[PDB]
A paper describes a structure:
GBA2, the non-lysosomal β-glucosylceramidase, is an enzyme involved in glucosylceramide metabolism. GBA2, like TxGH116 (the bacterial homologue of GBA2), induces hydrolysis through the conventional Koshland two-step double-displacement conformational pathway typical of retaining β-glucosidases, progressing from 1S3 to 4H3 to ultimately adopt the 4C1 in the covalent complex. Very recent publication by Shimokawa and coworkers reports that a GH116 exo-β-d-arabino-furanosidase from Microbacterium arabinogalactanolyticum termed ExoMA2 shows similarities in structure to that of the GH116 β-glucosidase from Thermoanaerobacterium xylanolyticum (TxGH116).
To firmly establish the mode of action of β-d-Araf cyclitol aziridines as mechanism-based GBA2 inhibitors, the 3-D structure of the GH116 bacterial GBA2 homolog, TxGH116 from Thermoanaerobacterium xylanolyticum in complex with β-d-Araf compound 2 was solved at 1.9 Å resolution. The −1 subsite of TxGH116 is well conserved relative to human GBA2. Electron density shows unambiguous covalent reaction of 2 with the catalytic nucleophile of TxGH116. Reacted compound 2 is anchored by several hydrogen bonds. The OH group on C2 interacts with NE2 His507 and OD2 Asp452, and the OH on C3 with OD2 Asp452, NH2 Arg792 and OG1 and the alcohol of Thr591. The OH on C5 is hydrogen-bonded to OE2 Glu777 and to NH1 and NH2 Arg786. There is insufficient electron density to allow modelling of the end of the octyl chain and the azido group, which extend into a more open region at the edge of the protein where they are less constrained. In contrast to cyclophellitol aziridines, which mimic the 4H3 transition state, β-d-Araf aziridine adopts an 3E conformation which resembles the 1S3 initial Michaelis complex conformation.
Author numbering: 31 to 802
Amino acid sequence: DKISHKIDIPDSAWTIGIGEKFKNAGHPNVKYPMIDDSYVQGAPLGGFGAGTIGRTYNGGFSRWHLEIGKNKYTTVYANQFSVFQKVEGNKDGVAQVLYAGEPENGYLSSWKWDYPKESGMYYALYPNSWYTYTNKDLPVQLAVKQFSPIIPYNYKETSYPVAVFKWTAYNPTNKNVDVSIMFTWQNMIGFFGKQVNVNSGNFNKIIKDKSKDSEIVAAVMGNISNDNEEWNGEYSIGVKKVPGVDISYKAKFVTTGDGSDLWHEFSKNGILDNKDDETPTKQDGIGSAIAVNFKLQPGQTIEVPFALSWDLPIMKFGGGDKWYKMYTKYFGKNGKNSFAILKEALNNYQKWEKMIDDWQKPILSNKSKPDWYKTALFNELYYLADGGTAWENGKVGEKDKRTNNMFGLLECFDYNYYETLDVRFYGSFPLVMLWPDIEKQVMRQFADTINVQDSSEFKVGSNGAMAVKKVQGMIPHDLGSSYALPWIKINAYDWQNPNIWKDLNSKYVLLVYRDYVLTGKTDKEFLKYTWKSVKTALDKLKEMDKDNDGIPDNEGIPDQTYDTWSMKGTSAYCGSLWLAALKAAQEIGKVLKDNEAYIKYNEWYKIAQQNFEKELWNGEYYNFDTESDHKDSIMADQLAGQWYADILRLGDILPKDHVQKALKKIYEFNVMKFENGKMGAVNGMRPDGIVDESDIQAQEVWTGVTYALASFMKYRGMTEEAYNTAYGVYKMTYDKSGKGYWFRTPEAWTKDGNYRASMYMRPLSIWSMEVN
Ligand SMILES: [Ca+2]
Ligand SMILES: [Cl-]
Ligand SMILES: [Cl-]
């Protein structure tokens, strides 16, 4: 490994061997079908709302999120980087696909598959990832850095459907070596969302941009149709000329053949035929290839950038709506703009790298923080782009343009709901902290639904009863499903009735006030916009106080985010959120000079606080609730209200002494008595030190709950406990001794390490650990 010298991989990058087999991998622990794509994953490529592509540590383009809101795991074998090398003086060179595996479908038999084991490494620190190739049969050593310009406080490049592949090659040997690097790509028009003749009309064209000192050669892979089908658009791959490198190309090879049309050229001397052919295909799949060839002298280094773009301008959801994706604002909507996107990337990638560096460096250079923490903090952000993210720039065939661009991130793929608010309470820290204009947009979207009334009925999954879809004054669980109508038809979720949840309205208010606080307490307009919805939300919750203790009553069913775990009476969880929400609304009242509201919420808070304290404080911790069989369980999340109050600078809603004791209890029990504190905080433990069996969710660790708990610990000066607590989640996710959930962090696991709901929004809450 002489190539690690020649590139700058941060020490805190997640790392694994190319072709490594992992033995310990967890699987779903539920009886219903649940996604399990295996541990062969990697950092995603693609911007917010662009659709993302998961290129795994083995080199394959395998996890396809190009259809917005869907997860399709399948390796498109034609999509690869390959290398040719010939030592000066030898008769023959060698050619190798940089993929640790081979096709399962008979095609491309001529290519050299099965990249050997123990011959290179994969590294990731999102949005960056790297491959190193250190192969006894490749005298020139190779590395690539790949990324998308995911950049905080930037809403432009961050939207781009583009990836850069920055290659470094170095000759440590005593003889000259001829090297070729070749990028192949399948014309994947028709791969998603086309019912018949999936390849029909696909054609490929080569663009040579000869602008002086900025020469680019690219393939554009599209379709003859100029219609605006949601499957239509273009892919582009290409390369920028650098001194000392020659470019070659092949416009059209058949992907549904043996591959020799291309490979007989590449394997001979690493130079392609440069054959252009714009003839559309009918049945056969087709692809394009871009290569560079160069001679490396002893001790010489060369750097050459490739790029990939995809212009798929329209997203269609199952309910029929068709929307333009955000990046269309910058490149156009007609689906014929792949080359422009690619070119912007090839000409600006260095600037993008520095912008990413500028953002990561304050954290990476902080020598007080361990490497594992950094690994998790950055790599958890994968989900922001990878979470079925929808970001619209107009409905298709809309006359009126709007000022606003609606956004949504999925709960997960198994539970296909946009912006599940009970979850985003945890999972939206990165958006408020790094892309706050999106965050405020999302919360305006929630404000606008408060008073929506939809009197149509639905069957509640848990119990069979009928219920009203949306009630005036009750915040929605979610903003729809990719299978239906995102943003238009809310409350796609039906497992419980969210119109009687006791956490949604409180969390809504807490999120509003959070978003004001963590954007510098200057955005009075946002408070004005949301003020009425805040008062409605709290006033409707007050009415669910059946027993006149000043606090909404849990109703002996799962009426909150723990949607199989029944709460009854006053709960620590919903009770503390309520206290915190009342305190936040008082503060908003002071800010907006609304004396009537200040007085009302202050009075409500004083009564509720005293009653909460008297009903739940047992002298060690706050009981789970007042009326359950399991009322004295120790709930990891029992003081969620106070956690938020710390972030929102609302002071003590509960006495400092009691908080400290509760947190110590949770660490001693829920953490340290659960598999020795190596796997997070189990949600419910009995006071005798055995896990609560009342419901599966009590027996689960929730990744997003544990990261949030860790931040609460940290704010309260329990530094060791905080990081020890978080460490278990890191360990399970990323470590060789864990369960193999990198780039698919799940909601939850049980004691045995098996999981529920991979690729989940809630653990983005690790960013609460960075709160200033
Ligand atoms: Ca009550
Ligand atoms: Cl256009
Ligand atoms: Cl360390």
